[PDB]
Amino acid sequence: AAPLPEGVSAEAMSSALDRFARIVGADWVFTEDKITPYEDPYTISNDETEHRPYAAVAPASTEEVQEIVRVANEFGVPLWPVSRGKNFAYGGAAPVMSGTVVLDMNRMNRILEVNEEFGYALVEPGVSYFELYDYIQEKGLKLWIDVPDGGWGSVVGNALDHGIGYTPYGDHFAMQCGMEVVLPNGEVVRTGMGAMPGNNTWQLFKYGYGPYVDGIFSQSNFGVVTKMGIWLMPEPAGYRPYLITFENEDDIETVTERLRPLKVAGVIQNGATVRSLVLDAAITRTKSQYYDGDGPIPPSVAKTMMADLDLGMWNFCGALYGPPPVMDTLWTAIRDSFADIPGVKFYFPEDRRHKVDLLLHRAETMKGVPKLTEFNFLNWDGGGGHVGFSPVSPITGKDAIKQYNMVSSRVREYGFDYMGLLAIGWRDLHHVTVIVYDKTDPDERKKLDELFNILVDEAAAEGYGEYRTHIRYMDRIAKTYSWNDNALWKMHETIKDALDPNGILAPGKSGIWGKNRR
Amino acid sequence: AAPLPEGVSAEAMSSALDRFARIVGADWVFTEDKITPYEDPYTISNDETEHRPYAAVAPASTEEVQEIVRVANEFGVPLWPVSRGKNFAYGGAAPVMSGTVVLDMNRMNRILEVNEEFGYALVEPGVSYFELYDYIQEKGLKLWIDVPDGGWGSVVGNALDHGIGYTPYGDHFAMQCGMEVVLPNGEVVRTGMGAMPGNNTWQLFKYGYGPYVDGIFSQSNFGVVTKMGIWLMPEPAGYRPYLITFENEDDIETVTERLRPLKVAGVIQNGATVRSLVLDAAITRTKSQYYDGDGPIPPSVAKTMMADLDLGMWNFCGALYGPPPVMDTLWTAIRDSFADIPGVKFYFPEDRRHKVDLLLHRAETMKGVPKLTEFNFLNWDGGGGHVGFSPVSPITGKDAIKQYNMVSSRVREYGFDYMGLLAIGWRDLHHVTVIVYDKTDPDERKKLDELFNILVDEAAAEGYGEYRTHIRYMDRIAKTYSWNDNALWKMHETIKDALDPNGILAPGKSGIWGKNRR
Ligand SMILES: Cc1cc2nc3c(=O)[nH]c(=O)nc-3n(C[C@H](O)[C@H](O)[C@H](O)COP(=O)(O)OP(=O)(O)OC[C@H]3O[C@@H](n4cnc5c(N)ncnc54)[C@H](O)[C@@H]3O)c2cc1C
Ligand SMILES: Cc1cc2nc3c(=O)[nH]c(=O)nc-3n(C[C@H](O)[C@H](O)[C@H](O)COP(=O)(O)OP(=O)(O)OC[C@H]3O[C@@H](n4cnc5c(N)ncnc54)[C@H](O)[C@@H]3O)c2cc1C
């Protein structure tokens, strides 16, 4: 079973569960066997006392949330809010500290507004990418959404976690506009213009007046977000996805050099993604279809996969947006930036000879169509879980290839296949390492945990820091931001103790604890 | 003279001034007659005990700032930070509360970095738009800056106040990336990746890890910003400014309807500005050159000015950016959106027959060239000060014209000329009212103060709220954001008391006081 959270009497916990049950009704308080949906689905720990949720409560309304939060204060019980809790590779729905009651906000799934003239939506945390896409299609509205690679997750939760997608609206939190928040004391606030009664501008103007605070409720335990606005891209007048491939692994140095001017200037309109061979292949193939051995793939097999699949060692999947004349012009600039590189190949969808193909999968993603089929890389090695590591770096060939060499060697010494991606947002490069592992085998869990720790350690030392991580690694990633004896987190701790003096909101999120657990 | 701030002994103040003088050296502590630079230059109050600064201290370094702040705590003296304090129409350098020691950061004017590959700058608060433009030109770097209408002011201070400009980088705070902050206790923090020692990514990636807090130091008294990064637009491959004019005052309803789709989609790349006749004329003419009477201008004079100056009743000044093919395409969409409106006229600079002309002034602004000559509207009526009122509204003809009728009537009943502007950022319309008044005449001060109060009152009631205001009106503008008995400001007060328990930072900025003055 799961243990009580330290400092919390068994009487006080059962008093809390009863008063929660009055608030949401007895049907919506979960214990015992009902609680396995809220486990980490991709186990990393070998210790079964860690990241174990104790109960779940699922309110219907903002006001029920406040009532819980007030109760949680009275009995000093901690809560762990999830919008839908489909945060795979980050912990799923599970809390950092054991003993935590999960506040599940699935049921709060109303789409309050979708406005076509102004290109926005106002949504509760329960609304998924699938629900929002389907609503938009059904009503015939000319708006695109921006989806991660799995659309069963939360428009809100993903944005609060600094999620990304693959359209020009790829920076989810950046497109957030207006929120309603239940503070850790149980008071309700609205940010920006929503603080102004009678406004029709909540989702039109981010700032409102005075200190801009939306951001303090992202990657945070300073409040529970119960409503959130997000800007939506008007349907454009044109759309052309492409794939550029490169033959050699060393190609990533010059390729990254040429993306810099294109990205900084905005000639490329979405995030640029340059994916390694195995990461792309694993969408439509598995390792055992190409190699017998338990080890990572030898070079000769890599060549086979390249020739079969029409993929390079690096694969740049992008998309043009806008009227055909603009697209033609941007394409001339993009293509010309890469033409002189030996081995380079350029494809539009018509030129892909396979009808089950990387480019045809990612054409859907790059126009905001949510889909299940990215999760296919999970099957590369017979079926397991994934871990991601995605630190930030300057957009430089030299930083690109250093990260590639550093990571690929260690991943491969550990017997995993190198699956990596060079992503660029706007001025920021991320080298994303994804490691598929057997979540059911404790010997591979020990291996993966150690590998992850080392990668983080070696990346930080070169200046590369993580921006989003798994519940398990939250403290570790916090300790990377340590300038002036951890001055930043001390300020976080100061705000935490002011908004949450009893520390009853997600103790340990982003490595923020509060005075009682510190 | 100026009075001591309430609650502060005369001994304690002179102890503070001495220990400040040890910190920055005696040359850099200002009293008595040295203190008139830091008065409000555009007097609104008739009471000479209000917004009166008591002393000024001008440190050299971040560490001097911290020392002051620690001293300020010991003796409970309040500080009012200005970067350069050239905040005209908002109070200049003056504090809301009297008695406040001005912390002047002019001397901290080093440009720490300008990076061409990555399109950013790292600047101290003392750096003006003029200094940054001149540095960029001198070193030959292909970067544009984004300037307000007066470039003698602070890249930092303007961004912290939510300032705007007229290029695609018009949203200044939005382009902010990374800051160093001295907290009200005197500790120093860096946000985002700057918290990570050895980073080369401080100005490349906004968020870093965990709660995003940059925004809490804008329009705020939660800290003193001592360094700040800002993204800079790479020099584009082309640039074509334009002016579209319209004959009738009612034209602003359809004009605003057609801008909506263009702005939401981003076809117009900079903020759209549609300026009333007098606001544009006053750049190159004065009232007395057209009309004798003390009143506002009659219609017959308006017609004269239109025919002389080749200006309409509304004037849409915009600019295309990028390679000629993209510009041609965007122009076709823009022009076609307006062609069917009776009286419409379209001009590029070549088609302006005057060599001292609105379009040739604003061509400079819309490519990031700082210039003095906007301040010319100040001379319309013989020379005075300005007040601005710029609330937010949905991008709607109906909201545009309601605001026009509401404001123009009252401004004109009060004997001022209607000078207004319809601006659009991205999804946000602002009706900006600018009122030029005689700052030296107390009867016109009473009039302007009353008018301003009424405008605010009538605009709020229709859903339109102010986002930036004069020191004098800060409390009033705060009280507009009152949903749930002022729940938002109560949270601001909570964070204020946690970061600033002794309340020694800009008491009253954005209507935030702290527990000792509340
Ligand atoms: C194969 C694979 C591919 C993926 N691809 C992508 C991708 O392309 N892009 C991407 O962004 N992600 C991606 N992810 C991660 C994940 O799938 C999505 O980000 C997912 O949408 C997040 O889960 P969710 O939306 O349910 O958010 P939630 O689980 O609801 O929220 C995530 C976290 O945010 C916090 N939180 C949530 N709601 C609130 C609230 N109301 N108040 C306060 N805090 C709150 C909590 O701490 C929670 O743990 C991928 C994962 C896998 C395994
Ligand atoms: C005719 C006219 C035209 C104008 N046109 C424009 C325009 O086009 N666009 C525009 O944006 N503005 C415009 N303004 C307003 C003003 O000219 C500029 O915004 C100006 O640059 C702001 O003053 P500053 O840059 O010195 O900032 P400061 O005076 O240094 O700062 C403004 C405020 O920010 C806060 N602050 C400053 N530095 C710090 C710090 N380090 N830490 C904490 N708080 C701090 C303070 O409360 C200060 O009062 C105009 C004004 C006039 C009169």
Residue numbers in the entry:
A (entry chain A), B (entry chain A): 2 to 519
Original authors' sentences:
Enzymes of the vanillyl alcohol oxidase/p-cresol methyl hydroxylase (VAO/PCMH) superfamily are found across all kingdoms where they perform a range of metabolic functions. These flavoproteins share a conserved FAD-binding domain and a more variable substrate-binding domain that enables interactions with a range of substrates. One of these, the 4-phenol oxidases/dehydrogenases, catalyzes the oxidation of para-substituted phenolic compounds. A fundamental distinction is that the oxidases efficiently react with oxygen producing hydrogen peroxide whereas the dehydrogenases hardly react with oxygen and typically employ other proteins, such as cytochrome c, as acceptors.
We further studied the P151G mutation to assess the effect of removing en bloc the side chain, and P151N and P151T to test the introduction of hydrogen-bonding groups. The P151G mutation was found to elicit the same oxidase-activating effect of P151L whereas P151T and P151N conserve the properties of a dehydrogenase. Spectrophotometric measurements confirmed that the vanillyl alcohol-reduced P151N and P151T proteins are hardly re-oxidized by molecular oxygen though they retain dehydrogenase activity while P151G can effectively turn over using oxygen as co-substrate and the product is formed. In general, the oxidase-active variants (P151L, P151G, P151I, P151V) all adopt the trans conformation that slightly shifts the amino acid at position 151 away from the flavin. The analysis revealed a consistent pattern: in the oxidase mutants, the 150-153 loop conformations create tunnels that lead to the flavin re side.
